[PDB]
Paper text:
PCNA is a ring-shaped homotrimeric protein, with each subunit consisting of two domains connected by a flexible linker called the inter-domain connecting loop (IDCL). Recruitment of PCNA-interacting proteins to replication forks is generally mediated by a conserved sequence in these proteins called a PCNA-interacting protein (PIP) motif that interacts with PCNA in a region between the two domains on a single subunit near the IDCL. In this study, we focused on three separation-of-function amino acid substitutions in PCNA that cause defective gene silencing and exhibit reduced CAF-1 association with chromatin in vivo, as well as inhibit binding to CAF-1 in vitro partially or completely (D41A/D42A, R61A/D63A, and L126A/I128A).
The X-ray crystal structure of the D41A/D42A mutant protein was determined to a resolution of 3.05 Å. The global structure of the mutant PCNA trimer is very similar to the structure of the wild-type PCNA trimer. Compared to the wild-type structure, there are significant backbone changes in the structure of the D41A/D42A mutant PCNA protein in loop D. The α carbon of residue 42 has moved by 1.2 Å relative to its position in the wild-type PCNA structure, and the α carbon of residue 43 has moved by 1.0 Å. These backbone changes in loop D and the substitutions of the shorter alanine sidechains at residues 41 and 42 are the only significant changes in the structure of the mutant PCNA protein compared to the structure of the wild-type PCNA protein. One of the three PCNA mutations, D41A/D42A, is located directly within one of the loops that defines this cavity. In the structure of the D41A/D42A mutant PCNA protein, the replacement of the larger, negatively charged aspartate residues with smaller, non-polar alanine residues causes alterations (>1 Å) in the positions of the backbone of several amino acid side chains that line the edges of the surface cavity, including residues 41 and 43 in loop D and residue 123 in the IDCL. Together, these changes result in the formation of a smaller, more “closed” surface cavity compared to the cavity in the wild-type structure.
Numbering used by the authors:
A (entry chain A), B (entry chain A), C (entry chain A): 1 to 255
The structure:
Amino acid sequence: MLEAKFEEASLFKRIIDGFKDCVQLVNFQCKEDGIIAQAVAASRVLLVSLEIGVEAFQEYRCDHPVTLGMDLTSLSKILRCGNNTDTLTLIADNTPDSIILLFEDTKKDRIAEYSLKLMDIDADFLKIEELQYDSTLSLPSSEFSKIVRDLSQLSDSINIMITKETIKFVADGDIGSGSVIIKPFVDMEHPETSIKLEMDQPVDLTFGAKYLLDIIKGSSLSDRVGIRLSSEAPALFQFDLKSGFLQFFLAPKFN
Amino acid sequence: MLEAKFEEASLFKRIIDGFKDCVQLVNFQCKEDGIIAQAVAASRVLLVSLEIGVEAFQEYRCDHPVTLGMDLTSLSKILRCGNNTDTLTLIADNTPDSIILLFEDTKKDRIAEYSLKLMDIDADFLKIEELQYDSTLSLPSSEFSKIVRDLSQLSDSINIMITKETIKFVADGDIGSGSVIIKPFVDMEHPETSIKLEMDQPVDLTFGAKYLLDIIKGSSLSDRVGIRLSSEAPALFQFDLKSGFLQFFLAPKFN
Amino acid sequence: MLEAKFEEASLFKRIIDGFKDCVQLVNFQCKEDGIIAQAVAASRVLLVSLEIGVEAFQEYRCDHPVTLGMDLTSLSKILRCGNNTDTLTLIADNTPDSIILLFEDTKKDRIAEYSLKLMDIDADFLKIEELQYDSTLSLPSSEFSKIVRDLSQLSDSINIMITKETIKFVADGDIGSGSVIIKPFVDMEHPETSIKLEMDQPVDLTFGAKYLLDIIKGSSLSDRVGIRLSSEAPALFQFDLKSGFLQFFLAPKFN
């Protein structure tokens, strides 16, 4: 018996909008220490990993573990409901068929109570992260977003390219070509406009722009995006939450 | 010879936007005491009844009765014209072929004068309202609108259900299910957020959500919606105007 | 070797948005005294003539003349890039294959550098303007825009009609008919709301509304539109820039 009460219903809506456009189904493992989730694109080139810790809820109680599969399209239809600053309460009784989402507003009158049917997904859950990534940068999520969006208009493939104190995004298509170079710097008038970079080995990797575009939708959810690149593994783009995170693992393009 | 001068052109535009999306044609009976109108959906499950009394015009003069039929799509194209705070003047000469709509703005320069061709509709006009309805509730039109819109995503049919001091809206579909319960209360910090209910007999009726969705567009036009339900007749949803009203009669779904 | 530096990148974007929707290709002649351009609709009923003088650039240097053809769809994709208040720098080396567009923002970090491939257009450039036009009016570009947009809903053809101190726009279709009359006046509380008219001969001409609609998009670019009509030639609609202009030559409809 689960009873997890988001402070503002807008968060859960947002974390789900954050990543709904790239994957159709999703398995939510609810535990004593919060809910965690994973979603693999059907293409198997993008994985979405989510963690919501207890400190992201106004209240939270999971007596036993529960796994809730659910169609993201359905769940987010239900999440357009209610008002934006209401208490959304996830509820499930043990070994369930239905999760129910229970919205109540700053007065006690509208008791809006939806209930979603659960899909059945098998928990081949993936641990795809690495100890050490060839490079690690970190920049404003809005910035990463303009440069992705901008370059996606030129071809299907954006090429990230990292060399000592130099992070370079590039697209190359029929129209023409595009090239956004950026460099690390601690700015102090807003220590959050900054750009961090740690390089152990230079990288040069290419990515589907389709997917980069899906990934940057997570900017609604943190001011900063951390992206970790490696030749040996999928790249990891990560948006930190209050308690928790939203990760996107993304595989590079071949030749 | 008709010469009816709306104060703000935005009103007539709005009362027509209020109900244009559900019915294609419309017969406007213009009389000494104002204009009244009726429109039946082709499906014959929704009737739209309008009254605009003299106190909704800055000026008004109908020498003899006139009936003006007109295609709502055409009329509302003409009503996108001019500016939003202009004097819109309906004009017709007796036994006419064309209504003309005459827009003029807060300076005397733009004389914008459109003219619409009249369709020919036969006046099988309907008196479908009842003396006593099983129940009568009354709530904020914006509220009724969110709860309609919210539930319409779950199935094609929303089910209203009224029992002593309890008004309950419900939808039930494949996704899952939804249930918004609401209760009467005189609030006094804004006596207009309130919720009134008068029940003589409990009701339980189902409605096309298509149509509920068309109906709530009338919320642009009054802060409050009054809805009157009966087993023996179509339900009546009503938005009050300054002088007049916009009614929707709506028939329930069968089995 | 060209190096032309718009103050705000938004201008070049805007002058191109101003007229991109009517013509697909465009030949930009760059010279010591600025850049000038011409674009003919494939229908050969609309010509677009542009002049950007040196005083529209923060810096400008054209060593030798250069002609740059370019697909407007491609160029404006590139012009959605960067931020709205950045320095956009047109660059070309002599006898080039590629123009490059170089965006930099109010801090020196994002060096965003796109490059467009040039099409090959033959410079059959047109001098289609007249010494004396039957009439010359001049009005607020936003006004000309509402009256165009408004009337276009009634038919495919708007008819301008000028007679001593009387400028009259009219549309006539199946729906009905529309008629916006306007008259000259020096207003002084804003000498820019005014309406000027000079008539040498009355005119009566008809125009594709398609095209009038494309033309009025130039209102983003000047508060005033000047339109010059003649029976013997295409009408000239003109939006003045800081240093330069955007003209539309438009041919009348036959019978």
